[PDB]
Each structure stands twice: as structure tokens, then as C-alpha cells.
RNA sequence: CGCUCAUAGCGACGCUGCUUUUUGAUCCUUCGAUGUCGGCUCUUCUUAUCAUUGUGAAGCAGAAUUCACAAAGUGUUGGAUUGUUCACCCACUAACAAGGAACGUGAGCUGGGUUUAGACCGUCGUGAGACAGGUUAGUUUUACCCUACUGUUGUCAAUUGUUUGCGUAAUAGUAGCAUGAUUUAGUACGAGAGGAACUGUCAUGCCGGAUCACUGGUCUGUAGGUUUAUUUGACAAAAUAGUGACCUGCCGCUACCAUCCGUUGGAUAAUGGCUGAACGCCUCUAAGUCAGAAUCCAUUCUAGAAAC
RNA sequence: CUAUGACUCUCUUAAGGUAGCCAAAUGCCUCGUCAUCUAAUUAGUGACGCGCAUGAAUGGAUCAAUGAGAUUCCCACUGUC
RNA sequence: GACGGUGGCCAUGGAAGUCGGUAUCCGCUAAGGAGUGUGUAACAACUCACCUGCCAAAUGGACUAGCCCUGAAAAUGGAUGA
């Protein structure tokens, strides 16, 4: 999923968003919620969580939402941390805020994407830096 | 039962495994590179000390990484170099059984570095005083001969070389009596150059830029933070009960089980986390630090284009209670072991690694000597800080 | 004529790229081969700057503009600027956006004599963004989404829009823009149709992703 | 390498070091400080423990060229 | 059967073994009392090898799969439900292979089952009562002995020089492993559908060893700031509330809640060849020899001997 | 053929389960069948009921308040992450 | 060297020893199956049975049965007792 694209696992890097916790939507899907069941790639260990990034791509649910989408498996795209990191640039970013977006396997993701996204998830995902409302 | 998870990967490392406290107070290693090089060009080691860590920014080296030319900060370990003070010539002859002490020889100008291993030493004592009783070279004609005998031989009979050196660590911050003494292993051209050449060093004075270049990667040595004995917790990595309702331990549960009938090596216990040796390799060493003669300060900012100032790569305070740069130093990639103010060790790389990453150049951007609720960056918290107060402020707290 | 170009094996050749009536712009990408390319093709026309914008492999989506001004957004450092400039001819206004509340490209299509512009965007900045360029800023959506440069494929000599644009928006964004508004996509069906063709008057450049008769309908409506 | 401000605060971000916050008001803060991110967050512009350099500013005790900034 | 074609891959009726990871059979051991089942923890080992390393077959064109050798060097996951191993689903992953260690692991835990008393039902019982039936509540003691391990002194409670330094290095341990994106390459291959690899680069997952320049964490710095109550006549500045609360908080420790660092040589196994017989040809084998594993042993690193 | 058994024959012992209720603290098979709740439920709840072996003061069914009782889910809870 | 009848009859209208069914004979020769495969549209071409030239003394085979090997995998580190 796709796997082709574009390009790597994107750098230096630090997860917190593990598995459990509910994100938001910041997209024109009709859910609000992405519930993260678990992070792709994440191989792991004995008792560790599948962390998600803010790029790594996830599986995911919406717990709250339109009723065509809720219940059912979905997948997505992180695209902000509630918890900080560090970047290539030796620089911390900082959002309180914590959000997903919607999307197939395919790497395609659906209409607009409101609020910041990541750079480093644009980065990774052209459909993201294409319909992205604000980068940072 | 299986296990049954898969992992269990042993919590730890078993080529650390004797953990105890380290021998020498110093760095130490008992290895050294190989024989493929010119001649006392190539030292091999050399002994610096720690004195803590800054940043510096600089651009990267590789294509297709964030830009070969973006720039990233990166952390450095700042180490204070003083140059060292060769006086014994070691001649080790390889035998049956490995090397072995034939017989060294000494400088006769110098034998301060004797005494400077008495005055901590002795309990009866017949011979504080000044003198000898594991025998040491003194005289001007009679043992000039004796010199002469030893040097011809160790010359002619088999196998490598290392000169005593020492450091200087009375003009160091740090106040010793005592100094540390050290082998820097001779590599490279003939075995007669190597004999003759370490004679004529005796009285000369080496530098940590004798050694090293400003772009070469190290084998660095140190003796780890002595934190002291501490439990199975944080001495292996394990796990524990963290909703917590068990009336034993932080510490594990199964050492061994029922299984060999006994209690094994390879099962993590309680014992210290802090004097161990070991050796990190390849590290990039980013800029040798030049003497200062306590007038200039250009000398220990590096370039004046892009660190665009004149300053030490010491902190707008400076360093009152640690370690302070008065002297040649070493920007290394960041991290080495060791606490903030100790005795390390370099050794050049056992393979001189060639690779990309590693061989190629480096260019420093910015050096910084910033500080938090206690002092800030160079001249602009200088300008500040001064109005307030009269006495108490002069950008020391001293 | 119209060539179909990848970009880390995707279909995606504006994210990475950028091409207007002058100006091309390419992130330093791990691969050098796909930059390489770009540069054959336009061999002593226009200069390919070589340079990953906002420090990024984004390029296409983080920037505006087409040969009278061009444009950037606060996110990228001085040096970054820098060294846009010194590629590029130093006739064209190079200039960094204050006060950021949007990526610019997807936000910010236009032409050699007006600019659809976010909106949302902020007087002020605005305002500036008129400046930079000289051309007028005409504050229109299209119809469903807010994202205009990503949803128009706007140049001079034709613009390719997306089927969900509405009959009479279309009707009037044409009159608006003294160009014509044509249905249709790129790449089988994707939504996003700017990302997957870059237009320049002389050569229009495209994904691997299309269908034959897409490029050929393409090739007709920018006049090649 | 370059430095840059607060926007939070008149005293200067040194280079590298301190940490951004994307609010989702799509506009970036970069903060010296927890204490002053804290601050922000209070909503109450930096005079409250008078240490900070703020404070001292607006009030103008034993300060000539802090106040005037 | 696998079109055809016994053995690419399977394999009838039939026949021989091994195993002790099933359960029985037995009753040798224990009723002067081995604490029974699972889960957590943690190591070790086995290989009947799921992945990866290297190889050889295939109905192996490519792709993916299947079969086999060497090999146990490194991996061997996250969850719902279940007292539960077992079971069955969701999700990741290169893969989520089976096992052993007193059915590993109770002075390591927990007690969810099983294990007493109280008690509800249902079936059975004239009844007291019964149940490999269901339900519910039910005190998990002790290491201050020897050994084993971990670290810490000290010693040949002198081997028949003091005293130290700088050293050696026998013996033992030993560490890094695995992925993806791109480059190759939309190339080779393929009618098409599709679609590789060596090689290069940048990264990433787990493993290990360090470190604190940044960021965050913590606060008896009882360092400042704020304020509750009481006390000291008031302000003042203090005390108590076992640190009164709260904010901020260096130094210090510490975080995949950060940063840095993890090598190169020989020896081979399988196996692929050479020259070349026995067996005038032949044949990698017999004599001989070449290439060749995540393998072995060195180099590296740890420790440093009643060893110098 | 009914789901079931009012019924008719017949035997046992006098009769042969009416109202209701239900895999119930009562269902071996059993993780029953269906629906729901959960991404996934040997769990929960609501349906179905030849019910191994429910059922009318051995009290049947209901239920507000009440409960250091028993179970499920959601929300406040994130070092019981 | 390995033929003539001969492309044996059939199926075919190509299967001409060899996709393939059934008969499977005679000549001539030192010898040559109405043919052992490879190959080919099936042939052609090549090889095999079959024979002979040279070299020049042993050769071939089906079994039995000693030792050895394969078969012959499992759990602390280990056992002809070393």
C-alpha cells in the first residue's frame, strides 16, 4: 500500500500515536473520528504497541462517524502528533492537536485535507502535499 | 513450556557481560592498528579529556538525504587535548606466548613524571625522599652507555614498539600530582626508524594534531559514568508489573528455573552500572581545536565566516566549576563514554574505514555557547544582563 | 506534443515538479536520473533549479507563479530563497509570503494577467501576493473543493478542470479568466488533475498514468 | 545557524534549540521556553513570575534599554 | 493421480522405524506432606527450519508458489473472546515454525480456574445428602543457614624478596540482526496479463553499547513567584499544615517523551567445478585441487588466571 | 406432516405442564440458531425454544426504590500507557 | 557401414520407422527392428539395436555375505568408563 511511494520511510522520526487512541478526521469524509487499530510496518516486540508516526501509513476505524463508514476496518494517513519531535533540521514541532486522514490502500486519499499537515507526511505522500490545505 | 514469546532476546549483551569496575582510571585498550603507514607521523593514540558537549550546525555530505547542502544540527563532544610529554621508549619482543617487557629505555633530561607516582604512594617508605627501587635510568655518562646497549638491542631483536607518554594535567584546569601515563603504539615503515626516532621525541612535546587530521574517524576509548550498584532494572533493560498488585520486586522473576538445577551466568542480577570500559568507533571528528595563548579567541571559534563572531567554543559564562578549554582540543561527532570531566583515550581506527559518510570532508556552520536561567549566547545576554546589577552580575557568578 | 513523465516510479509530476510558461523547479530527489531528464528536455530554454523548496521534495504544491512574479511561502529559510534566485533568471521577483495560513500552489492558479487566488486567505496577504506577481487575484473556489492550482490546471493558451465543477461557476470562471474551462481528468479517473499534468505553453508534461486519447484530448486544449 | 524570535516573547530564540507549536490555526508559534509556551497557553502576556524579561519592560524597574525594546 | 508421463509434486492396499511435545496402561519413587492448572516474568537448550544466509530440484519463462541439503547464526508480533495451554477470529510482519528444561519458572507474582467450610439453582435422593453439572464469596507464611548467580573487598591467612608503575595475554565470554523506497528498471523475462536480481544510495524495525548539546520528564535548590488556613499586635518578614497547595524551576539524574556509536580476515558444510583415475571411455573423488554459509575460528570488544 | 399438541387409542401410578419463563445463578450437546453491540466478542443484550434436566407459596412471572452483591457496555479516566 | 522392396498396409488425402491403430514379412549383405530415441508440420538429418576397421587380453552379468557407509532426528555440556 501502494507499496511504490515517494519516497522511503521519510527520515528521522519519533511515534507516540500508538495503537487505541482516536484521532481526527481533518478531512471531507463524513466521519470526525480515526480510531488507530493498529500502524502498518510496525514488526515490534513482546508487549509493545504498533506506534503509529506522522506519516506511517494505518489501519484504522471510525469509531464516530457517517454511518456508512462506521464500523468496518479502515485505512488512512497520520497527519498530526499530540507529542512532539525532533527533525532532520535538529528542530522540534509541536502540535496539542492529533489527527489522521482517510484514504485507500491504493495511496489515494479522498478530496481536501483541513488544518496542518505534516512535511514530512507530504513528503512521503504526493496525494497528501496535493490536497493539503497548510504545511508546516 | 516453549516459552512462549518469542522474543526474549537476551535483555543485555554478553560481550559486556563481566560488568565490574574497570581497571584503569583512564582510557584503555590493548589493541592497536596494524602496520601499513609512514612512520612517527602515525602515533596511533593519544590522550585527551573530557570537558562536555555543545551543538553545531552544519550541512550534510551525502546526495539524495535531505539535501546534500541542507543543513542539520548535530551534537558534539568537546574534549580538552593537552599535548603530551613522550620519555620512556618500550621495546616488546614477540615470543612463545605473545609479547613481552625486554627492557625499556628513558629520557635522562626528565624523570619528574617517577616522582609524580611517589608522593600518592609508600606507607613505610624507605625512599620517598626522590629516589628508586623498581629501577630507573639516572646518570650523564655511565648510563648514556647503558642506553646505548639497550637501544642497539631492542633495535635488532624482534617486534613492535610504544613510547611512555604522559599527559599534562598540572596546567590543566583540573588540579593533579599525579599524571597519566600512556603507550601510543608506533606504526608503519621499519622497525630501525621506529627504535631511533622515539629517542630523539624524548623531549619533544606531541600534539593531539600530530596525530590526528581534522576529517578522520576515531577509535575511541573511556571509562563509563560510575552511576554505582544498582538492581536488575536499568542494569539489563527488563519489564515489570505496571498496573502493580505483587508483593516481591522491581526485580525478575525466573533465574534459571528448575532446568540445569542451578542458577546461571546468563541471567540478569544485581550488581553496578558505571566504571566499565569499551570502545565506540568511527567517529567523524569534526574540528581540532587550536592552543590558546590567553590573548586571542578567533583561534577557538573556527572559521569567522558563518560562525561570523570572535569566541571560545566555551559558554558565555564559561566553565567556573568543569573542565575549562585553555588548550588544544577536539570536536568529535557527539558522544563519547565517560563522565563530564574525565581521562579518555583515542586510538586512530583499527580499519582505517574508506567509505563515503566516514572519509569525506566536513565544514562546520555554526558553534554555539548558549545557556538557560543562568547565563544565554555570548555577547547579546552580555549586553542585558549588566544593567541590573552591580556586583553581583558580571556575566560569571564568580 | 506531450511526453509522459514519472517521478519515483508514480504518476504524480507536480509535487515534485513545477513548470509554468518559464521557471522549472525540482526537489533534489534520491533519484538523479528523473531530475536528469527534465533537464535534456529543456536544453537552453529554461533552467531546472536543482533545489528541494522549503528544504522538501515538495515543490509543485509549495509554489506559484508564472514568469512576471514567483512565489513562496514563509516556511522556507533565506538561504533556501537564496539559491532559488541564483538559479532562475534575476528579471522575475523572487519574494517570501508573510504571515503564513496556506500551502501555496494548491491554493494560488494563474496567469500572465490575473491570478485565482484561495480564497480564505487573508487581506493583507492578499494583497502581497498581488504585488509579487503584478496580476490581478479574482477570489473564487471551484465548485466543491477550496483548493484551486491543485483542481485547475490553469495556464494561458487552456484549463483542465475536473467533471464536479458546476455548469454555471465553470460558465463564469471562464468569462473571469478570458479562457475556456474544460471537463476532464488524468491519470484513469484521478481527482487531483494539476499534480498529474504540468503545463508550459511549448511542451505539456504528464503522469505515465493516462490513456491514450486522455493525452491526446489534453494536447488539444492547451493548443500543441 | 540564523537566528530568529519567540512570538511570544521580545527575547530572541538562540539558534537551533526551543520548540515550535502548530496550534491549528494554521500559524506557527516558536517558543524558548516551557515556561513561556505555559505562559501562552494561560493566555496572559508574559508578566506573572517577574523574572521574566517581559514584565520587567512594561513596568520599567531598573531597566532603560529592556524598556525601551 | 499428476493431460500425456509411477517417483516435479503426491501417493493405494501394504510394510519397517523413530519420537516422548497427546492419552492411556503400569504403580517403581513419594502420604516422617516435592504446594496442584494457567497467565506474567526470564534464561537456557532441541530441531522435526516458518522467516532470513548460502545452495540444489520443480509441472522454475517472469512473477509468486512448491520440494529438498547445510545450517538453530538472528528473528518468531499487536489484539477481541476463553480460568485456559487448546480453540477461533481481527490487524501487522520477512515470518508471525513445533518443542524441551519437575506437563521450565508460587520463600518470583497473581489466584482467573481447580482446593474445604457459607450459600442459589437444576437433576438425583423417603432423607441426611450427591453431581469429572452450572452459579457466587472464599486468610497464598518463612532466606538473618549452606551452596548457586551478581557485583564488592581481600588473599597465594606467602609461591619462600620489598615497593610500585607500564605492560602482556592464557582461559573464558563476544553482537548486531532484519526490512523497505529508490538506482538498476518499467529494464531483463514475457504474445499479452504482468514483471525480477547482482550492484549503488537513503532511510526504517527490532538488538546492543554509550551520552545528555537540544526537547521533554522529574525537584529538599524546601531556588524564586503566587496564594489558603493558623501563629507571631499591625505592616514587615517568618513559622506550622510531617515539603500546606499551585506556577516556574537550574545543577543532577533520565526518555525511541532526545542524541551519538555498532569492523575485517582465514577455515570450511552443503553445494558448483577443475585436472584425473580405479573401470584404455567415464566420472567433483579415489590421490589431488579450486570456489563456497547468517556457519566455524581469528580481528574486534569484556573480563584478566596459585600465568609472565 | 402442522411449529405445538387441544384430541383419540393404549400402558404405567393419580395425572401427564395450563398461565407464564428461558441456553436464565436452571441448556450435556454448547462457542445452539438469528439479530445486535465490537475492526474482531467461548463474553453481553434482545429474539427463537420436544426445555440433556424451566414452571406456579418446593411459589410462577413483573418491578420503582434499595444494594461495601453478580455481570456488560459507554463517558469522566492515559504510570490501574 | 547401418540398405532394397518401401513412402509396408491404415488413419491420411501430411503423419514419409518415430501424434497414433494393427500386421510386423522377404530380399540382399559383413550387417542392418517394417525400427531406440533426438529432431522435424510428418519427413529430411542424426543416433540406437545390428555389424565391421583398428588397438590388443581379458571381459560380462545376477546373486549370496564380511566389515564400512546411507537409512540413523530432540531437548544442561558428555561419554567403548576416561
Known sequence: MSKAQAVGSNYRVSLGLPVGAVMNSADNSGAKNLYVIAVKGIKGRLNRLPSA???????????????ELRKKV????????????????????????????????????????????????????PKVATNAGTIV | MSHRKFEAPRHGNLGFRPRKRAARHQGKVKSFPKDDRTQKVHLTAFMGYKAGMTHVVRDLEKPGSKMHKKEIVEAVTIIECPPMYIVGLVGYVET???????????????????????????????????????????????????????????????????????????????????????????????????????????????????????????????????????????????????????????????????????????VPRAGQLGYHHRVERNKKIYRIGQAQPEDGKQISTGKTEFDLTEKTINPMGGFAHYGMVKHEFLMLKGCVAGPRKRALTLRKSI???????????????????????????????????????????????? | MATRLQYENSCDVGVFLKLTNKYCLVGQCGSKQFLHTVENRLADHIPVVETSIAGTRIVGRLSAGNKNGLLLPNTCTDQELQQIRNSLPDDVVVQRI?????????????????????????????????????????????????????????????????????????????????????????????????????????????????????????????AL | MKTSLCNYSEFKIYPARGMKFVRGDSKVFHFINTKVESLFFRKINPRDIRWSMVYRRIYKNTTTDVSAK
Open chain 1, 53 to 67: 508516526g506522522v506519516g506511517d501509513m494505518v489501519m484504522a476505524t471510525v469509531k464516530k462517524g457517517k454511518p
Open chain 1, 74 to 125: 479502515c485505512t488512512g494517513l497520520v497527519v498530526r502528533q499530540r507529542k512532539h519531535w525532533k527533525r532532520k533540521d535538529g528542530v522540534y514541532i509541536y502540535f496539542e492537536d492529533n489527527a489522521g486522514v482517510m484514504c485507500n490502500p491504493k495511496g489515494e486519499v479522498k478530496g481536501n485535507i483541513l488544518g496542518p499537515v505534516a512535511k514530512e507526511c507530504s513528503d512521503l505522500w
Open chain 2, 96 to 266: 612463545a606466548q605473545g609479547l613481552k617487557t625486554y627492557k625499556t629505555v628513558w629520557a635522562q633530561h626528565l624523570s619528574d613524571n617517577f616522582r609524580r607516582r611517589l608522593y600518592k604512594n609508600w606507607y613505610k617508605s624507605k625512599s620517598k625522599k626522590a629516589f628508586t627501587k623498581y629501577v630507573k635510568q639516572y646518570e650523564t655518562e655511565e648510563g648514556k652507555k647503558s642506553i646505548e646497549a639497550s637501544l642497539q638491542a631492542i633495535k635488532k631483536r624482534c617486534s613492535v614498539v610504544r613510547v611512555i607518554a604522559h599527559t599534562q594535567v598540572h596546567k590543566l584546569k583540573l588540579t593533579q600530582k599525579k599524571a597519566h601515563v600512556l603507550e601510543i603504539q608506533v606504526n608503519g615503515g621499519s622497525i630501525v626508524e621506529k627504535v631511533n626516532f622515539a629517542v630523539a621525541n624524548f623531549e619533544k612535546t606531541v600534539n593531539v594534531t600530530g596525530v590526528f587530521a581534522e576529517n578522520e574517524l576515531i577509535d575511541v576509548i573511556g571509562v563509563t559514568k560510575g552511576k554505582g550498584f544498582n538492581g536488575v532494572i536499568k542494569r539489563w533493560g527488563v519489564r515489570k508489573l505496571p498496573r502493580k498488585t505483587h508483593k516481591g520486586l522491581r526485580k525478575v522473576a525466573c533465574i534459571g528455573a528448575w532446568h540445569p538445577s542451578r542458577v546461571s551466568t546468563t
Open chain 2, 351 to 398: 580499519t582505517t574505514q574508506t567509505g563515503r559518510a566516514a572519509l569525506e570532508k566536513i565544514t562546520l556552520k555554526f558553534i554555539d555557547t548558549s545557556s538557560k536561567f543562568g547565563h544565554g549566547l555570548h555577547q547579546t545576554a552580555e549586553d542585558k544582563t549588566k544593567y541590573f546589577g552591580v556586583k553581583k552580575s558580571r556575566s560569571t557568578k564568580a
Open chain 3, 98 to 222: 508573510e504571515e503564513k495560513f496556506s500551502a501555496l500552489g494548491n491554493c494560488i492558479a494563474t496567469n500572465d494577467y490575473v491570478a485565482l487566488v484561495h480564497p480564505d486567505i487573508d487581506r493583507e496577504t492578499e494583497e502581497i501576493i498581488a504585488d509579487v506577481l503584478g496580476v490581478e487575484v479574482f477570489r473564487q473556489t471551484v465548485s466543491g473543493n477550496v483548493l484551486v492550482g491543485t483542481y485547475c490546471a490553469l495556464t494561458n493558451q487552456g484549463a483542465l478542470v475536473h467533471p464536479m465543477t458546476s455548469i454555471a461557476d465553470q460558465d463564469e470562471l471562464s468569462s473571469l479568466l478570458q479562457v475556456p474551462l474544460v471537463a476532464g481528468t488524468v491519470n484513469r479517473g484521478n481527482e487531483c488533475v494539476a499534480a498529474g499534468c504540468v503545463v508550459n505553453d511549448w511542451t505539456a508534461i504528464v503522469g505515465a498514468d493516462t490513456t491514450a486519447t486522455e493525452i491526446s484530448v489534453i494536447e488539444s486544449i492547451f
